[PDB]
């Protein structure tokens with residue numbers, strides 16, 4: 001393997017913004033490595049994205 | 059009717075947080091009055107909610 | 117304007133699938149023409165997409 | 175522990191419908207046990223829900 005681990009701070013690289021903590025994972029044929037990210041601005045709200053859409057930040 | 063109009067600043071009342079501008083509307087049998095809200099923290103990201111989940115703020 | 121109107125049957129052109137009825141609209145700088153679509157397979161569930169992601173079907 | 179495992183067929187118990195396979199997991203304070211579910215009707219589309227919202231089916 002995984003690019004990210006639980007608790008890593010990540011953001012969407014482009015397009016619609018999203019930033020916060022890795023809180024989970026998923027895997028489909030379309031998205032064989034995906035992550036759930038809890039917004040650091042909006043506690044409790046989670047969005048899921050393919051790994052290629054995300055980048056780790058400090 | 060409508061409780062909110064385009065551009066109103068709203069937030070989710072409870073549970074998962076969300077806050078920003080009304081940017082659209084939807085209507086289903088389950089949700090006969092729903093709104094699209096663009097996060098003020100994460101430009102471009104939009105989430106949809108029933109009217110009862112939202113409250114207007116200044 | 118609008119490409120679609122309320123009640124039009126549409127589907128996602130590519131990637132993750134989605135198909136059902138137009139039930140609403142939204143507009144942001146990133147997505148100046150977007151639509152809410154209620155799944156015809158999963159009543160009550162709605163997802164939002166830019167116009168370019170959707171195509172009308174009979 | 176987990177209520178469900180990868181590949182279990184589940185559906186939303188009430189409200190907006192969703193049905194398909196468990197494809198992932200997430201954990202937040204609001205949702206300490208959550209699941210990602212890929213629709214069996216719309217390949218590639220995934221939605222996330224708390225465990226209490228879901229039930230396993232054959």
Ligand SMILES: NC(=O)c1ccc[n+]([C@@H]2O[C@H](COP(=O)([O-])OP(=O)(O)OC[C@H]3O[C@@H](n4cnc5c(N)ncnc54)[C@H](OP(=O)(O)O)[C@@H]3O)[C@@H](O)[C@H]2O)c1
Nearest residue numbers: 044045046047073074105106187188189190223224226227
């Ligand atoms: N709104 C959007 O467009 C959007 C997009 C992407 C992600 N999300 C994410 O979805 C999450 C919403 O969080 P939340 O605090 O509102 O809700 P939640 O606690 O994540 O619950 C989600 C939904 O599950 C159902 N549910 C929850 N508890 C249940 C129970 N005990 N029994 C039966 N059904 C139950 C309800 O479904 P019904 O509503 O069908 O009744 C509820 O609205 C956030 O993480 C958000 O980011 C939302």
Ligand SMILES: NC(=O)c1ccc[n+]([C@@H]2O[C@H](COP(=O)([O-])OP(=O)(O)OC[C@H]3O[C@@H](n4cnc5c(N)ncnc54)[C@H](OP(=O)(O)O)[C@@H]3O)[C@@H](O)[C@H]2O)c1
Nearest residue numbers: 015016047048102103104105129130131132165166168169
């Ligand atoms: N991730 C979540 O859990 C979640 C939950 C609720 C709401 N949302 C919302 O969804 C939005 C995502 O925004 P965004 O900037 O990533 O993407 P977007 O511009 O809103 O595009 C959405 C999706 O539509 C498809 N698409 C876009 N342009 C296309 C084109 N020209 N031709 C064919 N298909 C096209 C792509 O589908 P495919 O990916 O299928 O290729 C793309 O990922 C945000 O407003 C976000 O809040 C996300």
Ligand SMILES: NC(=O)c1ccc[n+]([C@@H]2O[C@H](COP(=O)([O-])OP(=O)(O)OC[C@H]3O[C@@H](n4cnc5c(N)ncnc54)[C@H](OP(=O)(O)O)[C@@H]3O)[C@@H](O)[C@H]2O)c1
Nearest residue numbers: 071072073074107108110111160161162163189190221222
């Ligand atoms: N799960 C996903 O990943 C995802 C992604 C994209 C779109 N969606 C869409 O989101 C919708 C979920 O439908 P649904 O039947 O579960 O739920 P809903 O009726 O659309 O309610 C959505 C959320 O709004 C809040 N809410 C609703 N009524 C409230 C009230 N009376 N007072 C305070 N808050 C209230 C709850 O928030 P909290 O959960 O914060 O308590 C609830 O989970 C579907 O249309 C689905 O497609 C979900």
Ligand SMILES: NC(=O)c1ccc[n+]([C@@H]2O[C@H](COP(=O)([O-])OP(=O)(O)OC[C@H]3O[C@@H](n4cnc5c(N)ncnc54)[C@H](OP(=O)(O)O)[C@@H]3O)[C@@H](O)[C@H]2O)c1
Nearest residue numbers: 013014015016049050052053131132163164218219220221
């Ligand atoms: N639309 C909704 O309301 C909603 C609600 C809940 C869940 N969802 C879920 O979100 C998923 C959408 O699937 P999908 O096939 O459209 O898209 P995807 O492959 O899951 O990609 C999601 C988004 O990530 C970004 N992205 C993907 N690849 C990228 C790359 N190589 N570089 C930079 N950014 C990249 C794009 O963001 P941008 O659009 O920001 O450019 C894209 O729209 C489905 O599983 C669906 O159920 C959608």
